[PDB]
């Protein structure tokens, strides 16, 4: 693909296929969503659904800039939503235009959440919280599998994060199954980092989240309760998501214990696939087996039975846990970025990456053939001063 299969405008007519109104397992009124790629949807709305304790837009004891930022007005008009949509699109293309990004995005599309939502162990059933309900011409809904949703932030505009629906009796993000990932994110804000003169490239910030989603989609995310003292406690999951310099803070023994752990979980999945006798939905047990064979890179014998290939597993696992990292993306983008995760944002800026004179798929802010080309001038909020508005 050119990755994104078309230039959506927010006002484009619904077609029930890649532009439609949907519900996200909550009752909520439908919202307009856009499938920008197989398995990948964008909902240009403030996220007031995915959390019951988060259905409003600033709380009494709210933190200040540049930790949090509030504006209940943001993303409330069609112009804003159209802009949000086109911004997110641009960043996907920018990420995809790199070899690293191309791979991460491919692993994500392949990373279909396992069909382990059945009581019978020989039955393959999709978990409903891994689908969205898509409105059809008669007002009936059809359930559709998806891997990733990009959605507007909740009350706190810069609280970017991966969220997913849970299970009464399964730890989807940690058992090798994976679940559909909802990424609260905005293309219209970024951060000044130490030292905050220089602005973070929004493409890096999205990639960061895409890497979390990668982990979660393959059920290999690490419990946020697992932390490492750094001086301060940071979660294993974040340190490894950033990578680079921060790798030093990660206990290699635990690192290896998780690896063996998840190899086993993949065996469980292989074993389950072998025991499967029925499926729910419309193709196909055999087809879903192939789907998951590809996701977990399982080896298939002549009798069609599946098993985990140690080599293929080690490569897959390494790819997801220490090749897809923020630090590595920085290298590919050749932008300026914090060299560690433990770096405080010193400011927040409103931006607009949609105009091609502002930001390109190829150079981000540091446009070639402009004064902004050299020394990361484009990321210098004092030099490229018409592209950034410092907040409060």
């Amino acid at each position: 693909m050119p990755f994104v299969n078309k230039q959506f405008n927010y006002k484009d007519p619904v077609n029930g296929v890649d532009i439609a109104y949907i519900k996200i397992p909550n009752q909520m009124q439908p919202v307009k969503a856009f499938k920008i790629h197989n398995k990948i949807w964008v909902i240009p709305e403030r996220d007031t659904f995915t959390n019951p304790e988060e259905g409003d837009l600033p709380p009494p004891e709210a933190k200040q800039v540049p930790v949090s930022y509030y504006d209940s007005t943001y993303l409330s008009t069609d112009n804003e939503k159209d802009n949000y949509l086109k911004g997110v699109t641009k960043l996907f293309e920018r990420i995809y235009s790199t070899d690293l990004g191309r791979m991460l995005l491919t692993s994500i599309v392949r990373g279909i959440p396992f069909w382990g939502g059945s009581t019978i162990d020989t039955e393959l059933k999709v978990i409903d919280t891994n689908c969205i309900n898509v409105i059809q011409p008669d007002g009936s809904y059809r359930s559709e599998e998806l891997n990733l949703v990009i959605i507007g932030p909740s009350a706190d505009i810069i609280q970017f994060e991966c969220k997913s629906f849970g299970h009464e009796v399964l730890n989807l993000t940690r058992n090798g199954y994976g679940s559909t990932q909802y990424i609260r994110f905005s293309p219209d804000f970024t951060f000044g980092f130490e030292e905050g003169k220089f602005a973070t490239d929004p493409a890096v910030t999205l990639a960061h989240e895409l890497i979390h989603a990668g982990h979660r989609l393959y059920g290999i995310a690490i419990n946020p309760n697992r932390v490492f003292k750094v001086n301060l406690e940071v979660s294993f999951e974040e340190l490894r998501t950033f990578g680079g310099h921060d790798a030093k803070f990660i206990d290699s023994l635990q690192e290896n214990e998780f690896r063996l752990y998840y190899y086993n979980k993949f065996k469980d999945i292989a074993s389950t696939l072998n025991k499967a006798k029925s499926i729910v939905g419309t193709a196909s047990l055999q087809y879903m087996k192939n789907v998951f064979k590809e996701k977990y890179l399982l080896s298939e014998d002549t009798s069609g039975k599946f098993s985990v290939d140690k080599l293929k597993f080690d490569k897959l696992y390494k790819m997801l846990t220490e090749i897809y990292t923020e630090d590595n993306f920085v290298k590919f983008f050749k932008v300026l970025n914090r060299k560690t995760y433990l770096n405080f944002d010193k400011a927040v800026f409103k931006i607009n990456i949609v105009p091609k004179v502002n930001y390109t798929i190829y150079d981000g802010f540091n446009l070639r053939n402009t004064n902004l080309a050299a020394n990361f001038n484009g990321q210098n909020t004092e030099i490229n001063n018409m592209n950034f508005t410092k907040l409060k």
Binding site: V67, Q159, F160, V234, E238, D345
Partner: peptide
Amino acid sequence: RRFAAML
């Protein structure tokens, strides 16, 4: 999540 969320 941004580093801010560890605090």
